[PDB]
Paper text:
We have shown previously that a shortened version of human 90K-myc, comprising solely domains 2 and 3 [hu 90K(127–408)], is at least as active as wild-type 90K-myc. Since the individual [name]/[name] domains of both the human and rhesus macaque 90K proteins do not feature a similar oligomerization tendency, and given that a single amino acid exchange in the [name]/[name] domain of the short version of rhesus macaque 90K was sufficient to restore antiviral activity, we determined the structures of the individual [name]/[name] domains from the human and rhesus macaque 90K proteins. We expressed modified 90K [name]/[name] domains that contained three additional residues at the N terminus (aa 124 to 250; based on secondary structure predictions and comparisons with available structures of other [name]/[name] domains) in Drosophila melanogaster S2 cells and purified both proteins, which behaved as a single oligomeric species in solution, to homogeneity. We obtained crystals of the human protein that diffracted to 2.1 Å (crystallographic statistics are listed in Table 1) and crystals of the rhesus macaque protein diffracting to 3.3 Å. The structure of the human ortholog was determined by the multiwavelength anomalous dispersion (MAD) method as described in Materials and Methods. The human and rhesus macaque structures contained 1 and 3 homodimers per asymmetric unit, respectively. The experimental electron density maps of both [name]/[name] domains allowed us to trace the entire molecule comprising residues 129 to 250. Residue 142 (alanine in human 90K, valine in rhesus 90K), the mutation of which resulted in a gain of antiviral activity in the context of the short variant of rhesus macaque 90K, is located on helix α1 and participates in the homodimer interface.
The cellular glycoprotein [name] (galectin 3 binding protein, also known as 90K) is a secreted antiviral protein that has been identified by us and others to interfere with late steps of human immunodeficiency virus type 1 (HIV-1) biogenesis, resulting in poor infectivity of released virions. 90K is composed of a scavenger receptor cysteine rich-like domain of known structure, a [name] (broad-complex, tramtrack, and bric-à-brac)/[name] (poxvirus and zinc finger) domain, an IVR (intervening region) domain, and a C-terminal part without substantial homology to known protein domains. The resulting atomic models revealed tightly intertwined homodimers with the canonical [name]/[name] homodimer fold, consisting of both α-helices and β-sheets. As expected from the sequence alignment, the two [name]/[name] domains are structurally conserved, with a DALI score of 22.6 and root mean square deviations (RMSD) of <0.6 Å for pairwise comparisons of 119 structurally equivalent Cα atoms.
Numbering used by the authors:
A (entry chain A): 129 to 247
B (entry chain B): 129 to 251
Amino acid sequence: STHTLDLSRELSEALGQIFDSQRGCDLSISVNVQGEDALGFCGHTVILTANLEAQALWKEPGSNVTMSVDAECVPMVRDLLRYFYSRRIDITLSSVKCFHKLASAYGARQLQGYCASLF
Amino acid sequence: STHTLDLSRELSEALGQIFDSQRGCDLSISVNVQGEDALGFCGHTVILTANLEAQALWKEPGSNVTMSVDAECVPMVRDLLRYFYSRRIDITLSSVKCFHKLASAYGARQLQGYCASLFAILS
Ligand SMILES: [Zn+2]
Ligand SMILES: [Zn+2]
Ligand SMILES: [Zn+2]
């Protein structure tokens, strides 16, 4: 009797693209690299607070957060933050070390255990 | 050699629960029945503007929108709005006509096509 229309497969890229746009943000994320603010991004608290992986970024709208990362892991930060939206992430043997360090530091427990397996 | 961690199966209910909570809204939706404001909901423009199905609700934060619906279709409005978040919707023979009317009037084109096809299957 019940029929379901299911277009939820579109959600991962719809949310990923919200991050990519950097429009309508309500959270500022500064990326500290050995004492200096090397990178910046903005976030959407409505999306981030719905995700247990992004608990380090659970703040009220209008807030500012500071992340600290090592120079070698800078090219992986954008991918980590997009993963908090899309809930999808591509990991290689050359990036596993950095994603394990980032996930441990920010308590993204699903990603942390996934990288640990690949070590 | 690439390995993909994919937890996107959680997205539908994570977004559905944002609508259910009615917290952190930036859009007011009034449902008008026969000239009177019968019921109300609040929305999240960050989620709605990312969805082509939710076109009729593409507004700037702080806006107020009014939806006119027939009295018989009032029990279906919550499910239509939740569908704009979750991208999942349950349709029965007793609800198909109301979802087809709502989808047509508000331009939810994927749902409109689905109701039209489902009706041919059920009857
Ligand atoms: Zn069937
Ligand atoms: Zn693998
Ligand atoms: Zn039809």
